Symmetry: C4
Amino acid sequence: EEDLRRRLKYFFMSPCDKFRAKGRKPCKLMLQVVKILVVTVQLILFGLSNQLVVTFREENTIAFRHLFLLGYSDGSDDTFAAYTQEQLYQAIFYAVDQYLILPEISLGRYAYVRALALCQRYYHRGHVDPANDTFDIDPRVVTDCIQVDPPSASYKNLTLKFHKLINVTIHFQLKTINLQSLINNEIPDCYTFSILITFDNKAHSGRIPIRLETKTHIQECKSFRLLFDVVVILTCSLSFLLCARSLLRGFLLQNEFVVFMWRRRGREISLWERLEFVNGWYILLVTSDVLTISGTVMKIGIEAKNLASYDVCSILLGTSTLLVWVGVIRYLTFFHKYNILIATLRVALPSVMRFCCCVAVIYLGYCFCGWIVLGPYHVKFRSLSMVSECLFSLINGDDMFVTFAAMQAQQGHSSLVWLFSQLYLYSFISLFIYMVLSLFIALITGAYDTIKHP
Amino acid sequence: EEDLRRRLKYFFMSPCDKFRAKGRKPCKLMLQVVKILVVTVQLILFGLSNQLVVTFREENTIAFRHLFLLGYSDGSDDTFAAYTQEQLYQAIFYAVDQYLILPEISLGRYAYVRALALCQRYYHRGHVDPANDTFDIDPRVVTDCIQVDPPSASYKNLTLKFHKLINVTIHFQLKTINLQSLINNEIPDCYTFSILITFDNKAHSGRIPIRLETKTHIQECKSFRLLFDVVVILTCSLSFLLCARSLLRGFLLQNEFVVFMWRRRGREISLWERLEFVNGWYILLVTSDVLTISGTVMKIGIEAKNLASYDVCSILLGTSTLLVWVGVIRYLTFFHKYNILIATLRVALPSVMRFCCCVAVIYLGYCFCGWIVLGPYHVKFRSLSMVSECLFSLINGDDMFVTFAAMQAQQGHSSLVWLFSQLYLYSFISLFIYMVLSLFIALITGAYDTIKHP
Amino acid sequence: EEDLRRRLKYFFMSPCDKFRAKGRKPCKLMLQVVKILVVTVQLILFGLSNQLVVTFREENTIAFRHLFLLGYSDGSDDTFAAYTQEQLYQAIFYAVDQYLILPEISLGRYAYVRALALCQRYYHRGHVDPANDTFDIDPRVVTDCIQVDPPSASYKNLTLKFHKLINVTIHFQLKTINLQSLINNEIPDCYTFSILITFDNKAHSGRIPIRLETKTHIQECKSFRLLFDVVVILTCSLSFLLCARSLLRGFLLQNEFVVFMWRRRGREISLWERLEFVNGWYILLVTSDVLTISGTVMKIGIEAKNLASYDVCSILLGTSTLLVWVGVIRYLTFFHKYNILIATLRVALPSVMRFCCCVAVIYLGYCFCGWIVLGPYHVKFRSLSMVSECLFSLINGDDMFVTFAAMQAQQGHSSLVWLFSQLYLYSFISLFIYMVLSLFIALITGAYDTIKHP
Amino acid sequence: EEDLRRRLKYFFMSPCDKFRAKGRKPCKLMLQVVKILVVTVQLILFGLSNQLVVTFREENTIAFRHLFLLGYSDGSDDTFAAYTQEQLYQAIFYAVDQYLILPEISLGRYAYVRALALCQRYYHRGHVDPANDTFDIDPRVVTDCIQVDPPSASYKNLTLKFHKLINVTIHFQLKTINLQSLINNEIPDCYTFSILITFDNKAHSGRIPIRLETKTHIQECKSFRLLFDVVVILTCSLSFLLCARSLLRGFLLQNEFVVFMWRRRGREISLWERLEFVNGWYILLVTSDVLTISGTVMKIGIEAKNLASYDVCSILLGTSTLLVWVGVIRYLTFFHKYNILIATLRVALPSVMRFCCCVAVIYLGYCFCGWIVLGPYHVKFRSLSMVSECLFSLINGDDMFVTFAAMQAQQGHSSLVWLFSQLYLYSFISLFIYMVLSLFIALITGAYDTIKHP
Ligand SMILES: *[C@@H]1O[C@H](CO)[C@@H](O[C@@H]2O[C@H](CO)[C@@H](O)[C@H](O)[C@H]2NC(C)=O)[C@H](O)[C@H]1NC(C)=O
Ligand SMILES: *[C@@H]1O[C@H](CO)[C@@H](O[C@@H]2O[C@H](CO)[C@@H](O)[C@H](O)[C@H]2NC(C)=O)[C@H](O)[C@H]1NC(C)=O
Ligand SMILES: *[C@@H]1O[C@H](CO)[C@@H](O[C@@H]2O[C@H](CO)[C@@H](O)[C@H](O)[C@H]2NC(C)=O)[C@H](O)[C@H]1NC(C)=O
Ligand SMILES: *[C@@H]1O[C@H](CO)[C@@H](O[C@@H]2O[C@H](CO)[C@@H](O)[C@H](O)[C@H]2NC(C)=O)[C@H](O)[C@H]1NC(C)=O
Ligand code: NA
């Protein structure tokens, strides 16, 4: 078949060779430049909206913490607590008293929403007695709510139950108007902050942490976006059909190649020669194509009705734009100078992934060994996730002297954990910097030397 | 002997070759997968207990420091001291006054244990007189204890002896009940905190540091563990007998090989050919086997009676689990692609250990040179351990600009230590990053090239 | 042409060969040593002036912040704000009251300049009402200035408009005399500080930041420089004519080489053989020559009349001195041992720049992916510039554990961004340290091996 | 000459070959093991004395800062200053009032030494007038001392001259007794602290920094060392004569080799063959030998009379011990496996030192370019030393994100320095990590490959 050879001349032909031979063929290549530009501009333009929204969220939450938390200096979100009995009464009474006089205090136009509800939660049959070691506990949790309305004995005389206490929560809402939007020449977005001050007594340890949490329900008051957002799906869908048409030809031209080796007696050639016939780049491009058109329909559903679930939308558009940019490495491999550079990973990957298991095992071994031993006597090694972040930080070198000095300052309780800590940390750091990183260098150099000489 | 050749065909045979030839042989290999799973699950399940115990320890100790230490802001454990005469009286009197009214203050159910005992320790014949330089010192240390019982002149009128003073210690106990255990659906663990507030006057320098230390005596109040903890020793002992049986065959089949070369006149072959006959992996597996069965019997002795010595138990189980995971590199070397990767250290180790001595000497030389010279004029170089941690941190690069700026900010006392500090630090950092790390890279690359071509 | 061959013997001849053959030829080489010394001494002598000027600027600005800002502890320039209504009145009234009694307070000789003007700016028709969601806004900004003269009702009774407020600015000037100049034995420089205290209400979020800014107008009161500053331009201009004369010979001797290959039928030789004939070092030297003579005329215009625009002057002299020092690598390549070392980049540059695009794309991909996703739930990833600085810091390893712990401490809002953060950060750090840095090492080693064997 | 060949057989013979041939020759080698042990034990034993001395110095200096400085919280040595007029009067009056009542306040036995002298220094003819710009200055500095004797108008009514003020210094002495020495079972060391509180008004900027400095005059009150300190000089002198005897033989056996090539007509062989005949290790050993015997005589002169100049003594003993440890690399090169490892630097050094100049030039170029440009607008780049420490810290990677964020937070004054800062820092970091470190790796690998194959 002299035509099918001429097809395979044209199937493996680069478009540069095809342009200098045929001409008038940008029909595939113009899309994959437009699609890069259209997706990334859509990403940046959407990414500048969340700067204004999140900074107007964060500044209002800080301005709530100075108004409703007693004695709050900044940079102390974690080590802020109430320890005696009177500090908890003062922290509650200050919050409600700073709520009731809010227009004569604050600096924004914080209106009210019809309001405040105080509630404590205590065990039903609580009986704790360390002198006699007697317990008789019903674990049913009963609440005791107090209603407070804004414009003392309706609110005061609130006696807590410190011998059985779980949470004391304060819940109220505030409504305000973004005034920056008129400077940005648009229709405003009236927000609704939902504040939940939490006094936690979960561990029953006499250390009650205090924290404040907000939540916004964005809504309009009493088109460069939507025209562009149908362009980003029209381009991407047109590429989704045009690329799938090419893989459809790839499967069918593969299929009449499998036909010949039953007539030429090619002994039913296995997975190797048929992997050298289907492009792999269109796989990455089509799995970019699904994610962009999913995320933009999601974004239409965001701005229309539900201004909350930015999570799935952002995690799809960012991963789509990540996969589209790597699809420009497609263009570079048509040159005979880049073609050495891109072919350095196709031979190393079935060896460097073989070595990555041998590193991941030993790394996981030092994770389990370090976490149980240096769990109690150290602060960087509490949970297994935090051990994994600490040991992976120490490899490139982030925080060595802090991990050493935190061990030396207390020396554990006895000298056996300190003498173990010296051998543990020195052997682990000396292993992965010298003998393991070096092995990785040797593998990539040998894989490059395999590509260079032929 | 045609049978002994057929034994050596079967002795060096991989189990993959043995399964594809014989079949029905998982009898060795099923243990070393079960033993990985059983040990590590036992480790994680024991490792989650100490999270609840240690966090209930640490939160109660912080809640003691806010209640009994005068003017304690957090993050100031080391630079907390008493300097004048009245600050020490106020720091003692505040601690006892905050002890006597403890139920009307604290937030836990801290009961008392029959109580408080104040005691100061002073030299018998103390005579310090810098005007006349006269000393007449009996170094016998006499205590002066005060008994305080909880429900002023029994406690007040406590005049210290500031011209001869060693320690002022306050000792008392508190008993409480963990209430988190009922949420975790079990029998509680009544703790007993033992508090020792220490006012140290050891160096006699007018800087008395203040610190608080606790100690717990865990005891029950007035079975997924123990069934699993006999599985972890039954599996490991069965592997301890089954592996030792294999090394017993290895020594005996070695022994009748030594017999032949006295009849074949093999001239009493030395240590090389007989090292190529005994496996080394069973050595690591059997020294895992001793440590697991020692640590779990230790853990039974922990939870039954003595809830204190977690040190030896944790340092054995963690090291055992460390050696079991590295024993999965055993499995990878049966493939002819991993067999290049694992053979990169067998030839480098009698050369990279030859180079590790040449690095450890020069490193130790900069330790002794830096510690005496930059001892006084610098804060990172106090003890020799702290010099070793600082110089080893600077190699990968942790804290360079802090070590430079601490030198520049004072410039020592004169410019000779600063001009020495610049030459010391620049020559040391430039030595081990460029010329020494590079040598390590060259050694591993040459060792890989020795394995690759044959 | 036997003479033109003898010219090309002399044109490519090194001056070391030319000195050992001819002698009495330093006429080119003495300039390029003098020009290094003259430029760098001019740089250091100018660079020591700005130490005295800027430290006398910074110390006076700190001394203004302690005098005019209410409750200012150092290291808190960013988290200094006013949150309630009364804190803003106290922060304004404290600043003007500390202005009027300034000679009986301060420690310098701060005189007055005829003075203080307070001004607030508010919207004309401001109507914000979150209860009814009604707005009727004229965005014209009207000021309301108050005049205050130094030696209460002229200044007091200043009622702000908190429901429509943009800026409250305080502007005044202070004149002082540098007394360090008499110790430095010269004519003094009377400064004029121009202070602008700013109360910003741009975002309308109830968080008003406070900051103080100064500006100096240096002027003399009521010659080693200028003699040296004409030497630095006389030397550099003489090199500017002497080097351009050599490139003029280079173009003309190239031109009569292009003539021959039309008579010898050399087929109009392209860009390669004619690039091996023009020196590239004189290009760097002449673009040093333009920048030095531009910056020093600029510096004359600075010290004569306009003591403000140090920006263009410094950015030209520093870049000129940067290009002059690299012009000493010119001297080293005449030796046959350095000639291997300098020839390691001429062959790698059309391959390592080919690889730098393949790294810059993937790096830019992780920038766009990380910024939108971890924008809201993280503080290091606010703007795209700050993402680029954070991801480039993590490659060599700067701040890994802070970026991990800031993610773990809040876990976002839900676990999907945390589970995305672990995969994002681990894949990105493992990519550029192991597989990409290693590729760079392999390229430079192969480029050196290309130069070494021939 | 068959004997001189037999000498050269014995001259280049290793002692291992000489022991297995001759025997009873430890006469050279026993010294160089004893000398390592004797010097380092002398170093450690002297190095443990300065821990007790310097910590008794530092704790007393901190205890002075809490007693004599008004409002001193720790960690604030640099940002502690007095800004108004009344803060300087209160800082002086608090220091003298806390001096006069010192036994009823402090916790040590601080006696007095006959005492306190207050003194201020002001210009004689001071005339500063920014309204009229008139100056008439006599730079002669006149002091005004006040005498204060310990057991108000003798001390009060101290009117400063704020319009001409240089320093206000307070000087007094305190004597105490180290009581730790009786616990260490010895004769005590009565110290004499010399305190100099300094109020600096050098820059005349209205920011007066405050700092306290002490100085000790150690003296005894009203032998494992000295026996060992003559051993360390007896051993080292005996090696100083025994090694110089060997180099004396080396010069003389070289001399009768130069004789032969005038009779054999060897054409007066140059520096190469005569460098392959003199050992280089005895040069390092003899320059260790001078420094040890100098430093220990210095140490005798320290402990006898002058307990001050620890500078020259420590900087000689530390450098001597540095050179003695590297002299154990001498021993390793006798083995034919280490002999490849030690020979990796003899061929690289006349090439890696050729490359170190090409790096030091470009590094110095970025130092001069960065210091003038980013001098004013940045805090890490003030002096040229601090630029060199900052740029050298950024290469291995220490403090990248702090240097980037300090630039971004202010953006200079205008955007031109910020746009210059991005290009400066990115080009410099990308240059030395990728292209320059990689070049270093290639040089050491090629130098190892030159040694490996022959
Ligand atoms: C305070 O404690 C109560 C429990 O006593 C919490 O109520 C639980 O809330 C979670 C939702 O996060 C539910 O799944 C549980 O079923 C609730 N338990 C009960 C008994 O209601 C309450 O959420 C806590 N407060 C805060 C702010 O977390
Ligand atoms: C306070 O100082 C006394 C000594 O004056 C300490 O008592 C010593 O304690 C250790 C145990 O750690 C014993 O080995 C010594 O023999 C004890 N000496 C005497 C004289 O009793 C006491 O422990 C110190 N206080 C604290 C809390 O450490
Ligand atoms: C306070 O806000 C006003 C605007 O209400 C600022 O005035 C603007 O200043 C910039 C110059 O930086 C001009 O380009 C604008 O046209 C000005 N707008 C108006 C309405 O005048 C003022 O600069 C702000 N104060 C400070 C200190 O920045
Ligand atoms: C306070 O300032 C005076 C100068 O007014 C300093 O006196 C100088 O001290 C140095 C020694 O360090 C001498 O070289 C100078 O000659 C002295 N000058 C005069 C005029 O006496 C004094 O040292 C400063 N105080 C401190 C603590 O440094
Ligand atoms: Na750091």
